[PDB]
Design an enzyme around this catalytic site. Sequence first.
Site, PDB file in Angstrom:
ATOM      1  N   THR A   1      47.226  44.343  41.908  1.00  0.00           N
ATOM      2  CA  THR A   1      46.109  43.938  41.047  1.00  0.00           C
ATOM      3  C   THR A   1      44.866  44.567  41.613  1.00  0.00           C
ATOM      4  O   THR A   1      44.552  45.675  41.216  1.00  0.00           O
ATOM      5  CB  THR A   1      46.055  42.391  40.934  1.00  0.00           C
ATOM      6  N   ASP A  17      36.850  48.288  48.650  1.00  0.00           N
ATOM      7  CA  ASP A  17      37.525  47.866  47.482  1.00  0.00           C
ATOM      8  C   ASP A  17      37.676  48.876  46.453  1.00  0.00           C
ATOM      9  O   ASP A  17      36.746  49.660  46.335  1.00  0.00           O
ATOM     10  CB  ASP A  17      36.965  46.577  46.834  1.00  0.00           C
ATOM     11  N   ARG A  19      37.534  49.574  42.277  1.00  0.00           N
ATOM     12  CA  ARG A  19      36.792  48.961  41.237  1.00  0.00           C
ATOM     13  C   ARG A  19      37.460  47.857  40.394  1.00  0.00           C
ATOM     14  O   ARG A  19      37.162  46.681  40.601  1.00  0.00           O
ATOM     15  CB  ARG A  19      36.340  50.051  40.272  1.00  0.00           C
ATOM     16  N   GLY A  47      40.293  39.031  45.807  1.00  0.00           N
ATOM     17  CA  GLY A  47      41.603  39.671  45.586  1.00  0.00           C
ATOM     18  C   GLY A  47      42.563  38.639  44.982  1.00  0.00           C
ATOM     19  O   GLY A  47      42.228  37.480  45.023  1.00  0.00           O
ATOM     20  N   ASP A 166      49.072  54.555  46.312  1.00  0.00           N
ATOM     21  CA  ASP A 166      50.394  53.985  46.258  1.00  0.00           C
ATOM     22  C   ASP A 166      50.612  53.019  45.103  1.00  0.00           C
ATOM     23  O   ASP A 166      51.722  52.937  44.562  1.00  0.00           O
ATOM     24  CB  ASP A 166      50.639  53.270  47.565  1.00  0.00           C
TER      25      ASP A 166
END
Lengths: 219, 211, 152, 202, 69, 246, 100, 74, 234, 245, 205
Positions: A1, A17, A19, A47, A166
Amino acid sequence: TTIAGVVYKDGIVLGADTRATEGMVVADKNCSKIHFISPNIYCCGAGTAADTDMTTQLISSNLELHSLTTGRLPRVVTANRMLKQMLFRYQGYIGAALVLGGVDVTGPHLYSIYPHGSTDKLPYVTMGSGSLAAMAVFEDKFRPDMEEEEAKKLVSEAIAAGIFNDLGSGSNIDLCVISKSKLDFLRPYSVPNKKGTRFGRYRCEKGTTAVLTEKVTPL
Amino acid sequence: MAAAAVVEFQRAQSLLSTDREASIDILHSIVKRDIQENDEEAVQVKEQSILELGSLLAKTGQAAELGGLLKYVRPFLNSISKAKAARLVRSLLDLFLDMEAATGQEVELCLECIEWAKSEKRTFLRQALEARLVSLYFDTKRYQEALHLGSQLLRELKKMDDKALLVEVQLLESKTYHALSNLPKARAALTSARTTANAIYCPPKLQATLD
Amino acid sequence: MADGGSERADGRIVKMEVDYSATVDQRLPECEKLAKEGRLQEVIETLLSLEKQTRTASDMVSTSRILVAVVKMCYEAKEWDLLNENIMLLSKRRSQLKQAVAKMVQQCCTYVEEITDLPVKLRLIDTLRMVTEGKIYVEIERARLTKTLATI
Amino acid sequence: TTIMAVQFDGGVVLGADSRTTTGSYIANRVTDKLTPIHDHIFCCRSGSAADTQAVADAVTYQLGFHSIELNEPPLVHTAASLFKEMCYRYREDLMAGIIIAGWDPQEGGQVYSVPMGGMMVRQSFAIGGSGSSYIYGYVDATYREGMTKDECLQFTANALALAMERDGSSGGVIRLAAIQQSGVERQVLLGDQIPKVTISTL
Amino acid sequence: SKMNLSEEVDLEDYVARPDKISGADINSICQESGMLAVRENRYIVLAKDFEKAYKTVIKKDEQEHEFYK
Amino acid sequence: MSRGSSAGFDRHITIFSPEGRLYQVEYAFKAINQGGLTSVAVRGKDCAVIVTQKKVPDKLLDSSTVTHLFKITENIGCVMTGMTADSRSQVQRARYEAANWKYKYGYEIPVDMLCKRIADISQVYTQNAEMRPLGCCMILIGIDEEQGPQVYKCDPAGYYCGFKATAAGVKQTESTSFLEKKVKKKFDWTFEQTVETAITCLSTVLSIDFKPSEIEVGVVTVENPKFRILTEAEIDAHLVALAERD
Amino acid sequence: LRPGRLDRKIHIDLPNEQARLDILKIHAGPITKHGEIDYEAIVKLSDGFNGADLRNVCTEAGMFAIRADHDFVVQEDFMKAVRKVADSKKLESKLDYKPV
Amino acid sequence: TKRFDSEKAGDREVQRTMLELLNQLDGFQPNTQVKVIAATNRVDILDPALLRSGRLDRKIEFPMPNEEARARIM
Amino acid sequence: MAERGYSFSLTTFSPSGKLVQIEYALAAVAGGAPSVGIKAANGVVLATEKKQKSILYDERSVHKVEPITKHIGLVYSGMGPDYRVLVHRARKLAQQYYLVYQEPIPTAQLVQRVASVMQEYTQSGGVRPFGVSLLICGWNEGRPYLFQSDPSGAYFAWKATAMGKNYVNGKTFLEKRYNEDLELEDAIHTAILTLKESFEGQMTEDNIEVGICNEAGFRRLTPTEVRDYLAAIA
Amino acid sequence: MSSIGTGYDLSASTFSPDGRVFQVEYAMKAVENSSTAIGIRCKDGVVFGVEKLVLSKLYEEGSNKRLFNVDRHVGMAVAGLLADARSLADIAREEASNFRSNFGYNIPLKHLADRVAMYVHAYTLYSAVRPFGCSFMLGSYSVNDGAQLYMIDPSGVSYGYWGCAIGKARQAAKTEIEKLQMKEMTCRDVVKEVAKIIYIVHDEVKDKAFELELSWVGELTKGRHEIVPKDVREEAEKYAKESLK
Amino acid sequence: MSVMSYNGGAVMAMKGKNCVAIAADRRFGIQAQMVTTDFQKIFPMGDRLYIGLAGLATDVQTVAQRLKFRLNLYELKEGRQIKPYTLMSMVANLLYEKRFGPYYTEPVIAGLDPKTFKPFICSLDLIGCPMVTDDFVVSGTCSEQMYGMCESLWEPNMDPEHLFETISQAMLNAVDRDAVSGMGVIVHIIEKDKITTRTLKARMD
């Protein structure tokens, strides 16, 4: 996510981070800032599920504000931990927020990772969102467990770039938030890994495919 | 930019030690850095510099060195735009005036200062500055240049009479008309200074000069 | 006293110091002997200890004993400097009351007058200073000393 | 989870604690410190899940803190272990949290307690706990004896934790050992470069 | 001015602290200072004696130190 | 009418007077003077110090649990001056809030947070006509994290403010003005130096002249995380130096 | 009230622990007694004492000797006295508050 | 009852007499020759200037009769 | 721990038709420290006297000039304790608003909220009103703003206002010295002058606090910066 | 003053320009009316000696008793009005009972005393209610906190004493304590002393007649607050009588 | 404004951005799930009448929530002259929804608005539990929000004319009713401008 990390280095704290903010694995929005700037002293990375994280940061921010002003001490990360643990218990352990609180006290800079558990968790260097272990696992790998500030800042940015590569969920710009306790440098473009292809060519149409029989302004 | 306390001190040590000739290179640097407000927030860095520039002229007074400082301040006065701005101008003209290096530098500098006071700076400042320009000409004994200016000084500044500063211009003007042998003008101007002097906002000294 | 404090005067009227003033006065023939050799430190430490009390009484026993060594101190142009420091220092602190000290200092000024010509003139100015501040016996001594300087 | 243990010393306690709490594959806390205090009289070593222990841990801290300042002389340890009991009585069919409390109070003298997640409180010589840190049954029995010598106690604690981390999966990484005397806790950190490795199980 | 003075004694601090004390109050503190000098046995009045006096005889320099509202 | 509002209510209950500020509120500051306790607190850079009477009046009263230095909590401690009944009452309320804060909020408690929190409460007491403006004054010591050692005092009126030097008690005005001269002729604060200044002010003002068993001194030190009473050993070593001072 | 008729404002204020100690010795002086060392007990116990209260305890103690049937004051009688007068004065109504 | 600050009136025939009464108790004139047996219903009404311990030395409270005391009265 | 409270009539109307308590509360604010607020229209500047009459007060974190939130501040005059609860309360409303909207509370909105509190204290019995007049400042939504709230629970809009001792003279000096369409620098200069016209005499930088308000936020300047300003003014 | 319809004795929120609170003070004069209750701290326990007022001719033991057990090992002796004392007994006993339940160790006297004092003090502040008209002692023995004696007045103060008296004779009775060395002394010897002090202090106008009640809480009872045996009471009574002659 | 679920009462909004304006199309139907029998009843509200928020799906939660929010909006609007921005309303909506438990109000918001009276455009879309996103590109919103965003990003030249836009967005609606089944027939376009509300009626199947 989401892919968020914040770090304790030899300087202060660097948050990294991607976006994109997603409602599940699909993007609700491809613009704005995942790592949020609050009052001047407090920065928080976000997160896991979006809905649970933004609101938790916001509610604690009011509480922390009251405590900062009255006490006239700068915010402590242990202090920040206790407030999230108590609030999240009040709610009854609904939703998933892995939250990264990071603030500078008068001593060192202090960084904590609070998962949704309602734990009193002390890291060493942590990364959140996704799977807590999976993000945390990187810190042990690239950091020798302390190096100079500049070297560490390239290091976090490089490790976070790998998670973006990844895992395609994170998209757009990678932001780095260098956080002190009055200086919040929000560098939009630390690295841009990916971007779209231009939407130059239309899919517009003249009225002869759908027409209009009104143009009026009511009073 | 990098002036901090250190350069301000260094320039100060330099003046104390030898003289002005060593301090110009440094001086040029502090003024240029000041265009922003030096490092970070205004703080003692700005205080120390502003104090240092007012006090600087008129120790060994006259020189080419005194002139060098004068060029540097001209971009600086506009650029500050705070309450403290008011302070650079009033100080710097008063000390410069006390020990006149020469007529041209002072008249021209003062003019620039007035223009700035007249638009988008306070009424309060304008009255101090104007008193320097009239005083200079009178000392010089160019009555004519002071008399021309004198008319404007009367009209404009008149809005504030609850101030010492207004008394000062009117007194300086009355001395000049007296010399020309414009005797009704000098007499009228002398009563006018005493009328504005009545205010109990005027400190004892202003009253003594008025008698 | 009413200088501002009173903890030295009234509040503790008996102290370690007043008692000390008495014992050290007996020890004075030796103390004087040490002073002659030099021992600028040895004499001053006891003088200070004695006069950190603003009662007239304690000050009187301590002031009496220091005076005798002082004549030698005035004679030697390395010693004399030491004596002056106590009078100016006691005065500044919380005072010590000028009356008790003033009688002994009067005689100090008389001593500096006849020794030598030139270094005596510097010493005279300094000693005349120590006397100046009293409203008591000192006023005449002050005028007389100035008069001496005048003559040369 | 974490191997936590406390064995009763000379008239006070010797502790052992691990540093990971694992929820299966994902580490709930990569770094866990169970050596820190919860008042200056009592210390506890907290085991089970991460959330169940943390909530208990903050209430005993609050109650204990008020009690030492309100009384004027500090409270006793027996109070600390009862505060944890109360909480568990509510949570005895939902959560569980297996806390083993040890230090020493000055006022009534030394205590070693086990407050359970069902709610009980009982005095023991040594208790070691957690779900998968129950695999040292032989090890704890052979090592603990009645009034064991302090040097022996120190070795036995470190040694017992090692047997745990190798054999059980849940355990792992830096063993935090603490030896406590009457008013002071002294901690040593034993490397995770050191571990004695299990001998021929195949 | 009427009294003889020391050169230690500086007026400026004392006046600064209140914004004004009455006429009768200026007279008393000076009179007190002048008397205090007698105890010391000094004609010259010092900074310590003078300060004490300024504060005393009229009294109440501070009455918002706890009494603020 | 003169000599208090007896045909009026204004000292009977809390309501504003015809003169502005209440009679009752002003009157509360007069209750402090009744306690017989005078406290002098001096702010340093080594410790923030409180010097208060240990003084006992009989063989029958404890001194092993009677003290006016109180440990609100480890880092921050306080002294109460005035009425003894009101004194305990605020201390307990303060102690509970201090534990509760630490537990929920998680922030370490500086001098300001206790001081300000109590002060706001003592405003409610002044504001209600059931409750009375407090009979005691609280002078806190404790280490601020940004500032350093801090001494605050909160009013029974409900105001808090910072102090480099403060005094409260029977001789509130006399001691503060005395200590003002000591600030003016400034002392570079060592450990021994802040302790020395506080005792000389109180010794001169009361005019008893204290010895070490008669006072008890409270420090919160930058290496002590807890509140400690220095007791007689350190006090006597300073005490002699006080006689040699001036 | 304003100076120039009351320039000097001297307040003869409540006598200290040290002050009470010397004054009690003098008071002790006409007193026929077994002995008195009790000065220390008397000062510690005394709260808000002024000069009148000090003379009083000495009279109150001598009065208890008459009940005893002794013209010699017991050590018990000074201790009894300070506490008693102390208790009565405070309970009934405390001293007058005025500028010090 | 002297708590005076009375900015308006306050009698003061009564003030003069209150002060004069102290003076006679003071040892300008004896007080070993004049003893005062004073009866007043309350000490609440009275001011501390009068009460002291060297104007009125003993403070004897009178509680309402006890159970045995009423039988003696009868 | 047994009470019901008392609510009684000294808080009801007198026969004169004006409220007995409000007049007395206005008297409390008149006795206070003078406080000027000037809207520049280039930022809002608020100045007060730092002093409390003994300067043995630490005040490097304790101020009369306190930010409520990121760009709204209160400066007060009048009673110190009553202000302390109003500062604390005002913040609490600000953060409540902050949770919902994301913007900090407007000066226009905030005063009504505060006004209810002032009102409870007047209208119910067994309480008394706050005796503090508030100058509320902000810069938000593209315009700088200055509001007044007096102790009764009225709020009034002014662009230059003076308070405390010689509130009357301050309003006239503001009318005279400050004119419209001048800048921020000019505003800052005029406030210290209004405080000179409103209690006169000696100033140090520990006798004044000056705080400037922009969308950058409200900040109370450090002791040094305030010192430079002093020298400018007569 | 005392006769008035607004404030003074109606309130206690009131202050005089002296600072006094008259109502709280009137409550103090109330404790004074009845006979003395003394409680003496030993390094091993507390011994009480209480005058138990005989208000009739048809008495039984424990009638109008002033000895209460707050906790198992705390005794409470009251002096002054017994009406106010009964309500105070319920509040103190309740704070102790819950303490034992939660903490599981013997209530520290320093803690219990702080809580009851706060309660008395909440009423003295208030003008909404009057404050209790009695003064009490709590006295205790434990080995988890030692032997403690505390005293709480109508004002709401808690401070520890090592020997205390409340009631009419207390200024006289207290003096007799300074004579005795009681800080270090067996609870067996101290019973003999509390009994002799009471017999001499009593007179027929503080109260008509009394019944002697002494109580143990010390090494002898093994940390239990119990009433003394028939034997103990009588020998201590005897010594009181022999000293009285 | 806000509602419960996503298509369980129809309603679909798509916006295309013009330099001057924003165009918004929505069907004008109504009735639960599949049936969209009746056609007269609104989902989009005005929060300045030049700023709108629309929540889309069930009508009950639409009218109850919209009205209850309006009371608080209004009080703020009257109080402070400067009526609340775009930004202020997105955050207000996030906080108001999360607050409930019973009958959870999960809207998928489309805010259609230039800020205040000023000529600076905004378009935004939010998620079901509607944490706020700042954006100034293009927005499509509904159960299948991501499908409308993709297509809304692909259609414009860059910024077509306002005129050109009403016609595009109307066609965007017409294709989408076919992709779902929870709505269909009747289409209304509100071109939202900085000083006017142009209401246009698009051609329906």
